[PDB]
Each structure stands twice: as C-alpha cells, then as structure tokens.
Design a protein around this ligand. Structure first.
Ligand SMILES: CCCCCCCC/C=C\CCCCCCCC(=O)O[C@@H](COC(=O)CCCCCCCCCCCCCCC)COP(=O)([O-])OCC[N+](C)(C)C
Ligand SMILES: CCCCCCCC/C=C\CCCCCCCC(=O)O[C@@H](COC(=O)CCCCCCCCCCCCCCC)COP(=O)([O-])OCC[N+](C)(C)C
Ligand SMILES: CC(C)CCC[C@@H](C)[C@H]1CC[C@H]2[C@@H]3CC=C4C[C@@H](OC(=O)CCC(=O)O)CC[C@]4(C)[C@H]3CC[C@]12C
Ligand SMILES: CC(C)CCC[C@@H](C)[C@H]1CC[C@H]2[C@@H]3CC=C4C[C@@H](OC(=O)CCC(=O)O)CC[C@]4(C)[C@H]3CC[C@]12C
Ligand SMILES: CC(C)CCC[C@@H](C)[C@H]1CC[C@H]2[C@@H]3CC=C4C[C@@H](OC(=O)CCC(=O)O)CC[C@]4(C)[C@H]3CC[C@]12C
Ligand SMILES: CC(C)CCC[C@@H](C)[C@H]1CC[C@H]2[C@@H]3CC=C4C[C@@H](OC(=O)CCC(=O)O)CC[C@]4(C)[C@H]3CC[C@]12C
Ligand SMILES: CC(C)CCC[C@@H](C)[C@H]1CC[C@H]2[C@@H]3CC=C4C[C@@H](OC(=O)CCC(=O)O)CC[C@]4(C)[C@H]3CC[C@]12C
Ligand SMILES: CC(C)CCC[C@@H](C)[C@H]1CC[C@H]2[C@@H]3CC=C4C[C@@H](OC(=O)CCC(=O)O)CC[C@]4(C)[C@H]3CC[C@]12C
Ligand SMILES: Clc1ccc(CO[C@@H](Cn2ccnc2)c2ccc(Cl)cc2Cl)cc1
Ligand SMILES: Clc1ccc(CO[C@@H](Cn2ccnc2)c2ccc(Cl)cc2Cl)cc1
Lengths: 609, 609
C-alpha cells in the first residue's frame, strides 16, 4: 500500500530527472552526438545522480544503448566502479544491468575495464519478497544464471566471478536457480554452474553448501515444490546396480531424504511447510517408496496399537462419568420449573462403598492418562513455536487442540472433585464429547476411513463456516420476530419463544428442522406468526440447499484429487511424528546401511523397477 | 410481429415489381441486350420506382451486374444521384450498394460520375435495432469499414469522404467498428481510419469524439464488452517506462477509466449496463489492478467500518423491540381460543419508569438511523430513474429495496407509537427480519462469504421461484382435499385442517416436512386421508428432489465460474458507490498525478510486470 505507493513515485521521479538532465536524456535515446557536445563543453558532472542514484552509464545500460554507453566509458572510466545509491537499487552497478538485459557487447566492454564481478546488489528491489517480481540473487553470476545466459556465465567465471558467493539469505547461485519460474532452464544452468566446481580443495561441494536456514539446494527443491529440479538432483543420488531386460535395480542415497533426527530432513521440511507443491514431492520415486514402506512395516502397527489404547482409555473415562457419585437433593424445589432430582455428593460421601473403589481405579487411570497427554503435547510445542508454529500445526492438524483441551477438562474435573465444587457435569460433558471425537484422529490409519475424514476438515473450516455466519444472521432476525409475536401470548400453550434465549434456541432448531413447527390448533395463534414462519421456512430451505450446492462443487472436481493426496500427506505426517517420539529399538531405521557392502556410512533404499 | 410481417410483404413486393417491369428484370439477370432494346424504343422511364423506391441502377448494384449497370449510367447519369425513397431503405444510393457488395469496378465507375460520398442512408433497415442484422452506420465510409474493404475505404477518402461524419446516433465510423461482430477485422480497420486523422486542425482527434450518449470509442468498447477492441485501444494509453530483463514497468493513462465524478466513467458504465460481456473488461490489465488496489486500500476498510455501524444499529433496534412496552390485558377473553395475555401500553404509560428512558434513547437512535437511510437512498434514486433505472439496479442489487423497506417499517412503527395504534408487532416483525437480513449485504466485503451469497440471489430469483409456483399448485389441490376429508370430522382430535386458511398453512408445512403427519391412533381417521396423504408425500418427495436436481446442474458448471466473476463485479459496484458518496478527503484519488513528473494533468497507474 504505502510502500508500493512510494516505489511508484520514485519510478516516476526517475523518468522526470532523465528528461530534465541533458546528459541522462541523451543516454536514454542513444543520441551519441548529444553525448559529444556536453563533453565538448566541459568535463562536467558525469557524477550526476538521478532519483535512484543513476549515472548516465546506468541509464545507457538500462535502455540497451551500446554506442551511448561507450562515450561515457572513454570520457569517464570510473563510472563502471559506481553503484546506485538509493535504498531501492543499492549496490547495482552497470555490470548487473548489462547482464540482465543480455547485452553481451556491453558486458564484454565492462569486463575490459575491470568491472567488479563481486559487486553486491543489496537493494530492496532485489530481496526475495512477495512485492518483487524477480529474485535474482545479488551477484552478477546470479543475475546471469537467472536470465538463461550460458555465454555470460562463462564470460564472468573466466574473469574471476566466484561461484561460492552467498547472499544476505545465504543462497548461493545453485539455491537461486531453484527459486526460478522457468524450471527447465534452471536444470541446464544447474549443470553448467556445477561443472565449474572442479575444485576439490574448497572443503565442500556446491550442491552441499547450506543457506542461512540450513537448507542445501536438494532440500530447497523439496521445500519449494520444485519437482523438476528435484528429479534432476535425485539422479546424482541414484546408483543403478544392474539391468536385466526390462528390470533395473536402482539404489538410492536416502541421506538428506530420510529423517535422521539430528537435523531437519526432507520429510520433516515438506510436512511443516505452507507450499502446496511441496506435497507433490511425496509422489517422487525415492520418497514414495520410502514412506510407504515405513508405514506398512512399522508406522501402521504402532498407530493401530496406539489407537486401541486410546479406545480403552476413553471407555474407562466414559464409565467413570456414567457412575459419577450422585445423591438425592436436600432442599425443596424453588419453583415448579425446577426439574432437578439428584445432586452430586461431597468428597467424603463419594467413596464409602465397594462400587466407589472400582471407580476410583478408573478415575486415577483417567487422571494419569490426562497428565501424560499434557506431558507429551505441552512441552513439545514449547520447543516449537508456542502459538505461531503451533498454530501452523493446527491448520495441519486440529487434533492437537482437541486432545490438549480434553486433558485440561479432565484435570478441571479433578480439581472440582477435590474442592467439592458444584457443576462437574460441565467439564465432563466437554470431555466426553472431545474425548470421543478424538477417536476419528485414528481414522487416518485405515484406508477406508482416511480420505473420508479429511473432507470433514475441509468442510468445517470451509463451507460450514460460510453457512453458519449467514445462519446466525437469519436466526437473529427470526428469533427476534418470533419473540415479539408471542410476547403478548400465553406461554403455557406454545412455549417455544417464552424468553429470548429460548426463542433464539428454538429458532436454531426450527432452522435445522430438528424440532417441529410450533402449533396448537386449540387456540388462536397470531396471524403474524404464520406469515413469518412461512418466510422463515423458505429462507431456511434456500440456505440449507445453498450449502448443499456449495459443499458439492467444491468437493467433486476441486478437492477430490486433493483429499487423497492429503491423506497420503497425513500418513507421512503421522509417520514422521511416530518415528520422532519412539526410540530406535522400536523403530528400525529405513534402508540398508553401508560399511558391510562397500558403500560407506550411508543408508540405501533399493528399488527394483 | 406486425412490422416484421410488413417487411416480408415489401420484400416480396420488390421481387414482383422486378418481374413485371422489363427494365428492372433486365438489370437483375444482366441481360445487357435487353437493356439496349428498351432504350432503342424511347428514352423511357428510367425513373421507374420499385417497391422500395428502387431504380434499375439500384437493381444492377444489388445483383452484382457490372455490364447491366453501365448501360443505365451512359443513358441516364442522373440515376447515380437518386436514393431509395421508401421508409425501409431511405437515403440508400447505388454507391451504398456497390460498397457493401465490394463491387470495386462498379464503385470506381460511380466515383467517376461524382457519386455523393456524403449520402445518408437513413432508412429503418439501417438503424441499430434488435430487428436489423446489420448496423453499418449510414455513410459509404461507414459501409466500407464494416465489410472489411481496405481498398474502397482508401478510394472514398481520396475522393472526399469525410471521416468526421456522424449518424443519427452520433456514432462516427470509429464507433461503428466497435459494434461489429468480427472484432479482429475491426482492429485493422480501426488503425487505417485512424491513420487518415492527419488533421491537427479539426479541434479533436477521431478517437475522442463522443456520440449522443457521450461515449467515446474507448468507452463504447467497454460498454459493449468488446474486449478485443478494448485491449487494442488501451495500447494507445500505455507508456513503457523501462525494460529490465523480464521486468517491464508500464504506465497507464487512467483518464477515461477512473471515476473522476464529473462525467460517467468506464467503471460506472460497465456496472450499470445489461451486457454480460462488459463484465469481462474488469479483468483487463489497467482495470483489474485499478479496482483491486482501491478496494484493498480504501474500499474494504470503509465497508467493514460501515458494516460495524449497521451491526450496532440493528442490535439497538432489536433491543428496542425486545423491551417494547406491554401491560396485562384489561377485558376478559372473548372465547377459549383467545390466547392473549398482554397488550401494548398507550403512549402515556409507555414512558413512566427509568427503564423506559434508556429505551427511548435507543428508539430515537432507531428513528434517526431510519431517516438517514431515507435521506441517502430516496433522493439519490430520484436523480436516477425513479422506477426503471432504479429497478435496473434492483436486478443488480436487491438490498436497495430491502433497506428502504426497513426504514419505512420503522417510521410506520413510530407513527403507530404516536397515535397509539394497536398492532405494532406487524411493522416491527417485518423490520426485525428485513433489518437483520440486510447484514448479508456486508457478506460481499469478506472473501469467504462473498461468492456464497450471490448464489443465494441466483437461486431465489431462479430455481426457488420455479419451485414455488409448482409448490403452490400442489398445496392448493391437497389442502382442499385435506379440508373436505376432515370437514365432517371432529377437530378436537386432529385440528390441522379445521378451517381453510389453517388447512392451507398445514399443507404448506406438511409439504416442507416441518410439521409431522397428522395422526391420532385413538380414533378412526377417514380412509380417504391415508390415500391422499400417501399421494401427497410422493409428489412432495418428487418436487423437493426435483428442486435439488435443478439447483444443482444450474450451479456447478453453469454459474460457478460466473459467481466468482459476479463477486468481483460486486466489489467494483461497491467501490464505485463508496467513492461516489464519500468526500475526497476520505478517498484519495487513485493513481499518481502528473505536473510534477512532466506528464501533464493526467493521473497514472504504474504496473510492473
Ligand atoms: C458462526 C456464528 C457466530 C455468531 C453467533 C451469534 C448467534 C447468537 C448468539 C448470541 C447472541 C445473543 C446474546 C444475548 C442473548 C440473551 C441475552 C439476554 O439476557 O436477554 C435479554 C436481552 O436480549 C436482547 O435482545 C439483547 C441481545 C440482542 C441480540 C443481538 C446479537 C448480539 C451479537 C451480534 C453478533 C452478530 C453475528 C452475525 C455477524 C454479523 C432480554 O431477554 P429476556 O430474558 O427475554 O428479557 C425480556 C425483557 N423483560 C424482562 C422485560 C421481559
Ligand atoms: C409463488 C406462489 C404465489 C401464489 C400463492 C398462492 C398460494 C395460496 C395463497 C392464497 C390463496 C388462498 C386465498 C383464500 C384463502 C382463505 C379465504 C377464506 O376466507 O376461506 C373461505 C373461501 O375459501 C375458498 O375455498 C376460496 C379460495 C379458493 C382458493 C383458490 C386459489 C385462489 C388464488 C389462485 C392463484 C393460483 C396460484 C398458482 C398459479 C397458477 C372459506 O374458508 P372457511 O373459513 O374454512 O369457510 C368454510 C365455509 N363454512 C363457513 C360454511 C364453514
Ligand atoms: C493411565 C494410562 C495408562 C492411560 C492411557 C493413556 C493413553 C490412552 C494416552 C496417553 C498419551 C496419549 C497420546 C499422546 C499423543 C498423541 C498424539 C496425537 O496427535 C495428534 O492429535 C496430532 C494432530 C494432527 O496431526 O491432526 C494423537 C493422540 C496421541 C497418539 C495420544 C493417544 C493416547 C495416549 C497414548
Ligand atoms: C459438550 C459440547 C458442548 C462440546 C463443545 C463442542 C466443541 C468444543 C467440539 C465438540 C465436537 C468437536 C468436533 C468433533 C470432530 C471434528 C472433526 C475434525 O476433523 C478431522 O477429523 C480432521 C481431518 C482429518 O485429520 O482426517 C476436526 C475437528 C472437529 C470439527 C471437532 C471440533 C470441536 C468440536 C465441535
Ligand atoms: C458454528 C456452529 C458450531 C454453530 C453455528 C451458529 C452458532 C454460533 C449459534 C447459532 C444458534 C446458537 C444457539 C441458539 C440459542 C441458544 C440458547 C442459549 O440459551 C441459554 O443460555 C440456555 C438455553 C436456552 O434457554 O435455550 C444457549 C446457547 C444457544 C444454544 C446457542 C448456541 C450457539 C448457536 C448454535
Ligand atoms: C442514529 C444513527 C447513528 C444510526 C446509525 C445509522 C447507520 C447504521 C445507517 C445510516 C445510513 C446507512 C447506510 C445507507 C446506505 C447504504 C447503502 C446500501 O447499499 C445497498 O444496499 C446497495 C444494494 C446492492 O448493491 O445490493 C447498503 C447499506 C448502507 C451502507 C447503509 C448502512 C447503515 C447506515 C450507515
Ligand atoms: C416478518 C416476515 C413476514 C418478513 C417478510 C419476508 C420478506 C419481506 C423478506 C424476509 C427476508 C427477506 C430475504 C432475506 C435475504 C435475502 C437474500 C438476498 O440475497 C443476497 O444477499 C443477494 C446477493 C449478494 O448481494 O450477495 C436477496 C433478498 C432476500 C431473498 C430477502 C428477500 C425478502 C425477504 C424474503
Ligand atoms: C415464494 C415463497 C416465499 C413462498 C412460496 C409459496 C407462497 C406464495 C405461499 C404457499 C403457501 C402459503 C401459506 C399457506 C397458508 C397460509 C395460511 C394463511 O392463514 C392466515 O391468514 C392465518 C394463519 C392460518 O390460519 O394459517 C396465512 C398465509 C399462509 C401462511 C400462506 C403464506 C404464503 C405461502 C407460503
Ligand atoms: Cl471414527 C473411527 C476411527 C477409527 C476406527 C477404527 O475402526 C476399525 C474398527 N475397529 C477395530 C477395533 N475397534 C473398531 C476399522 C474401521 C474400518 C475398517 Cl475398513 C477397518 C477397521 Cl479395523 C473407527 C472409527
Ligand atoms: Cl451474513 C454475514 C455477513 C457478514 C458477516 C461478517 O462476519 C465477520 C465476522 N464478524 C466480525 C464482527 N462481527 C462478525 C467475518 C466472517 C467471515 C470471515 Cl472469514 C471473517 C469475518 Cl471478520 C457475517 C455474516
């Protein structure tokens, strides 16, 4: 908004300063005879700074004027050593500009005049931002690699441009190629820049240098969803054992792919990222066979065993609420609308029979199981982001909130049982609902229920929320109308709208048609009731069929191919989680280690095809 | 109907008069030896007028007879100065006909005989009508431009045909090209006719001359939805600042596009028009970035702020109806069907406690807010069309009617409160429903609810109306059958159909299944009831599933791509409305003005691409 307005004013201010400067105007439209006469007058301000700190050589490079750029260079060679000075294009020399324009006659002329090939374009328009259309890095090698200029990238390296140079983000030129929109040119420019890594004395290969986030180019291809660069980079990690007719046994390196646990791996990065195209990497041929085999061998048995424990635990909590201690009430009824018969016992009376001691066993099992949930969920999100990266795992998984909220409602029921507080049915009823609805976390391990259950998550976070905002507006209008229509009437015949919170709840139930329409037929109802309830019935039939259309076309050709891809992504997210919190004796590491096969200390996945 | 019948009889009358005239028949089938002998006899009626005022040169031009047309011209040259005289083809000379047929040998022969290139074909078959298949303008330059004849348009201009000539609609030849079905030939014929605007002494360029509606050719391309002519015309208004590799900074003129407020602009014309293809112009690259930036910067905050005020106002009106003054009834009940307990107070008793004065604050806030609605909606539609162009904005927006009807129902409740009239629940109940259902006007500002809420409008104005006409027919048959089946029975057991207005309302509720089927089981019902209610239940299950099919296929591949385009069109209609009624201090004008950048007094939108 405001900064994009400020960029627009500086770009218009650039064009004004070109027109009102006879030096800069001459370089824009290649009037070399105008370049002569301003130098015939005096050896004047070639140190004219424009709006973005332009010099006239920067103007001649931007508008692709060869002959205009020459006259600046013989008259003042020092303008090749000058960068732009403004905050928007800081550090950019005319070497950067001639490379991006692919003006090769100009960039040969600049390298003849020792133009600095290590100049860092550190301006704001060169950062990797949502508000910059290019991210070319900041070195002229990085700018040449992104414009697909195989001649200039050779020309700069043969004049001393360093292929080891990083940016403020730490991205080397191999990282920057992965961030490029034309992914096929990036593969050709990958191999050429990797070919100049002849040096076996630079301590580390170029494809193994991490950026400041600690990602290598291989791992950065997985995070960005760059499936084209991912398949290309993986062929360096293949090793074909044999070829038997149509058969081919291929051996995969599985080093940065597999979750080793010391550093964040390629499986962990893809699960925790916001790119939709990173999920496409899970179907690639090292990663697909890797995570499907550790699911079938070890992930799925340790998930169904972990669901059978949660099922027996939630039956144990359920029985402790069915058999909760209750005694007949003491006082008399305050009013004839008082429905209550029983009340909960105090702590002294709650354990005075042998049936109360079998319950006390299950209540302690419930308390312990709720603490263990808080011992494994509450600390392990503090080492992550407390609310933000936790909340980014809520859009990935809502069952983080639901089982923490379950375990809190249980310990609230414990504290209310200790201090003998009235109203234990409130935290119990939240916990029975939350604790049972957490069983459909375990629907993802079953191939029948798994894809069905993600479609729940898409429609609660989507279309059912769109419906409920417009439902609550219609309810607030009609519950208020139904309240005042029956505000004069006797409530002993038709009590649906007797006060305003019940009128509001009756209209919600009439909207969903889960209670019948109010009718007596023995008494006269207001005529305004039938007019209003007819209009209410049409608007509800409109909305509840609008939802059924909206839930439809969003979920047949839009997310039906996505729900099965997100089910396979939940298998990976479940397996990465179960491998992380279980010890190595329970989880044998995937692949086959070397060192007894001559392959090293790396772990290999053999895929026969 | 009648006039299309009259056109058909004149076209058959033309062919009869050709056959029974030996002059006109000879020119139709190119019998030049028959043309000789009628002139050998006498210098006879070459002034023969046919049915549409044809002469024989008009016949020879219509049937593409070169050699037949020559014999008319040497024998009588004055027939090139004659137009057709009938009302259907008035003004049409043989110059018009030879141009439309692209008979270039004939039109060179006519221009050799000083044929009038400024002749106005003002006949009814040349007007822009739904009942004419061509709109070619009315000058021979306009006819040449529409048949794609680049040779004849040069030939007429080099004989003196004026490119500044307008029609009865005021359309110059550049306007007429935009109205043409082959839009790609129109772009080539645009540039050629714009090339002959060498004259810098004709006070105004050809692309800047308005028609009688005040539209220029650029604005007429937006109104007609001519997206091909729109992109072509916009390239005259671009200005490329620089080109940096793949980047390009383009500067857009934004003069006739942006709502300046003095004259109707291109954004205002497209919103208020009935063409569906004009909505395609909103996705074009000056217009899309313009209206998305003024929505995100200024349109959406002033719309959510304006919805938060309407939400607090409608809660204030709601509480003033919940706490409406009511007293216990005075008289005794007229009958045991009288349900009423309370009645509304008179004006004297209505304000006699401190709780009635807090309500009086909110009641005055309600009265003032209803007048302000009538001060900003009722005058500003009178300056528009009172009912017609107002009603054309009802098919655009139904919330014009709904918030005017709300504000009327509030002031009716005020007048009923003043004169102390019984029955204030009737205008209150309409106003609670209307006032709350106007909150989903503000669903369009939210990207989640916006596309959902237009699908409400498509289905109430569409499929739910188709259902309700056929519902009311089925209800009127079965409520009448259910009335007479229980007409003999005792109503104290089953009172659903006790009189005819309740039988009609019960059948409506039984149709929508919002009340249960009438049953007693303690008494014998008529056997005709079970037969009828079974047939009623099948026909309702037929219809309510027919609707669910009809609401489906009309709204998945038919309007699902249209509902999102109509949501973006509502953003534009909301933004044009909010810019129009808010002052310039609240709304900073979009773009960047010139005059401090050497660009003039125009306002420019920079788009980097
Ligand atoms: C996904 C959806 C989420 C939203 C859920 C919201 C759904 C609704 C949930 C909650 C809303 C209701 C809360 C209060 C209800 C009871 C309060 C009460 O005690 O009653 C008192 C006040 O009664 C009133 O009339 C004041 C409340 C006006 C309702 C306006 C909505 C407020 C929120 C707007 C939000 C906009 C939402 C739409 C967005 C634009 C009076 O009632 P009584 O006891 O009968 O006394 C009669 C007087 N007598 C004593 C003289 C006899
Ligand atoms: C989107 C849909 C829009 C249309 C909505 C329409 C839906 C319906 C809405 C309104 C229609 C009903 C209006 C009158 C109802 C009550 C009148 C009354 O006082 O009752 C009296 C007359 O009762 C009758 O039988 C006469 C009315 C016959 C109904 C024919 C339809 C009229 C409109 C056709 C339009 C066609 C529509 C389809 C298009 C082709 C008698 O009733 P009673 O009190 O029981 O007295 C018993 C006699 N006793 C005293 C001897 C005991
Ligand atoms: C007295 C004792 C024996 C009671 C028994 C306790 C178990 C039934 C509890 C204790 C810890 C629980 C586990 C703690 C952590 C998790 C992770 C949790 O993961 C998510 O919900 C992730 C969210 C998402 O990705 O959607 C699923 C339940 C599970 C396996 C829990 C399953 C039930 C467990 C084993
Ligand atoms: C005692 C009552 C008042 C409890 C209060 C209601 C809410 C606190 C709870 C009750 C049931 C819960 C829901 C039960 C089931 C689901 C489905 C669940 O969807 C999935 O299974 C995710 C997709 C997948 O992993 O396959 C998302 C959470 C949600 C909506 C839960 C959200 C929180 C809810 C509404
Ligand atoms: C997003 C989904 C889960 C719900 C969609 C709308 C809800 C936010 C609203 C709409 C109608 C509301 C209900 C309508 C009115 C009432 C009565 C209200 O009254 C009371 O406090 C006591 C019970 C009574 O008197 O009815 C209690 C909340 C409740 C059930 C409301 C709970 C919240 C609801 C479901
Ligand atoms: C005592 C006072 C402070 C009461 C508060 C009054 C406001 C709540 C009212 C007064 C004027 C109203 C506005 C008058 C005009 C309009 C235009 C109206 O536009 C349409 O409905 C267009 C129809 C369509 O395009 O569908 C939407 C509501 C709105 C913003 C109204 C919103 C509510 C406002 C600000
Ligand atoms: C007290 C009772 C008897 C009131 C009488 C009923 C009608 C006078 C009112 C009640 C609710 C109104 C409806 C409430 C909501 C809508 C949705 C609305 O659709 C939109 O939101 C338009 C699309 C968009 O702009 O996104 C169109 C009008 C309509 C059908 C209204 C039409 C007029 C209705 C039926
Ligand atoms: C287009 C949508 C909004 C409605 C679809 C059909 C309506 C035009 C008709 C069909 C059935 C009609 C209802 C059926 C019968 C009655 C009873 C009638 O009786 C009375 O006057 C008092 C109440 C009673 O005795 O039932 C009042 C109107 C009402 C509700 C009618 C209102 C108009 C309705 C909804
Ligand atoms: Cl919400 C929900 C989530 C998970 C399950 C597990 O359901 C198990 C059945 N099962 C086994 C022991 N107790 C129940 C199951 C379901 C389907 C198939 Cl095809 C196969 C199996 Cl084994 C059930 C409901
Ligand atoms: Cl019919 C209808 C029309 C408009 C709204 C506005 O709803 C707001 C919520 N809100 C804020 C204050 N009071 C309610 C909202 C809805 C959805 C999303 Cl994604 C985001 C927001 Cl902020 C609600 C119902």
């Amino acid at each position: 908004e405001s900064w994009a307005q400020s960029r627009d004013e500086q770009n218009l201010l650039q064009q004004k300063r070109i027109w009102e400067s006879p030096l800069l105007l001459a370089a824009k439209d290649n009037d070399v005879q105008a370049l002569n006469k301003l130098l015939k007058y005096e050896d004047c301000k070639v140190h004219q700074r424009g709006a973005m700190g332009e010099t006239a050589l920067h103007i001649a490079a931007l508008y692709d004027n060869l002959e205009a750029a020459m006259v600046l260079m013989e008259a003042a060679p020092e303008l090749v050593f000058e960068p732009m000075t403004s905050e928007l294009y800081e550090g950019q020399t005319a070497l950067h500009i001639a490379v991006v324009n692919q003006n090769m006659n100009l960039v040969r002329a600049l390298l003849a005049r020792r133009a600095s090939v290590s100049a860092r374009a550190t301006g704001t328009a060169f950062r990797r931002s949502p508000c910059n259309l290019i991210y070319f890095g900041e070195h002229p090698l990085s700018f040449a690699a992104c414009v697909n200029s195989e001649e200039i990238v050779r020309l700069l390296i043969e004049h001393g441009a360093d292929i080891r140079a990083q940016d403020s983000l730490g991205n080397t030129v191999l990282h920057i190629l992965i961030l490029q929109p034309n992914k096929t040119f990036a593969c050709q420019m990958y191999n050429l820049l990797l070919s100049y890594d002849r040096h076996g004395d630079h301590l580390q290969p170029l494809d193994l240098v991490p950026n400041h986030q600690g990602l290598t180019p291989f791992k950065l291809a997985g995070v960005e969803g760059n499936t084209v660069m991912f398949q290309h980079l993986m062929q360096k990690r293949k090793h074909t054992q044999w070829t038997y007719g149509p058969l081919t046994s291929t051996l995969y390196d599985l080093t940065e792919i597999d979750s080793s646990g010391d550093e964040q791996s390629l499986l962990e990065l893809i699960i925790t990222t916001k790119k939709r195209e990173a999920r496409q990497i899970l179907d690639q041929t090292p990663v697909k066979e890797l995570v499907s085999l550790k699911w079938k061998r070890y992930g799925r048995p340790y998930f169904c065993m972990l669901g059978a424990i949660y099922l027996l635990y939630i039956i144990c909590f359920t029985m402790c609420c069915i058999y909760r201690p209750l005694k007949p009430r003491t006082n008399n009824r305050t009013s004839p609308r008082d429905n209550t018969l029983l009340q909960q016992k105090l702590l002294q009376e709650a354990y005075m029979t042998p049936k109360d001691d079998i319950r006390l066993v299950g209540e302690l099992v419930t308390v312990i199981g709720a603490i263990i949930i808080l011992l494994v969920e509450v600390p392990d999100i503090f080492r992550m982001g407390v609310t933000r990266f936790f909340g980014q795992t809520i859009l990935g998984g809502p069952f983080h909130v639901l089982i923490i909220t379950y375990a809190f409602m249980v310990l609230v029921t414990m504290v209310m049982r200790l201090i003998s507080a009235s109203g234990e049915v409130v935290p119990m009823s939240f916990a029975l609902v939350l604790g049972w609805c957490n069983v459909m976390y375990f629907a993802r391990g079953f191939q029948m229920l798994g894809p069905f259950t993600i479609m729940i998550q898409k429609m609660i976070f989507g279309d059912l929320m769109r419906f409920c905002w417009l439902m609550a507006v219609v309810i607030l209008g009609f519950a208020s109308a139904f309240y005042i229509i029956f505000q004069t009437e006797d409530p002993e015949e038709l009590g649906h709208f007797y006060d305003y919170p019940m009128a509001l709840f009756s209209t919600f139930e009439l909207f969903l048609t889960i209670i019948d329409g109010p009718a007596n037929y023995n008494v006269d109802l207001p005529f305004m009731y039938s007019i209003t309830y007819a209009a209410f019935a049409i608007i509800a039939t409109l909305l509840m069929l609008n939802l059924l259309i909206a839930m439809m076309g969003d979920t047949h050709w839009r997310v039906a191919h996505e729900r099965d891809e997100l089910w396979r992504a939940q298998i990976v997210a479940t397996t990465v989680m179960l491998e992380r919190k279980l010890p190595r004796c329970l989880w044998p590491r995937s692949g086959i280690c070397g060192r007894e096969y001559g392959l090293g200390d790396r772990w290999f996945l053999r895929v026969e095809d």
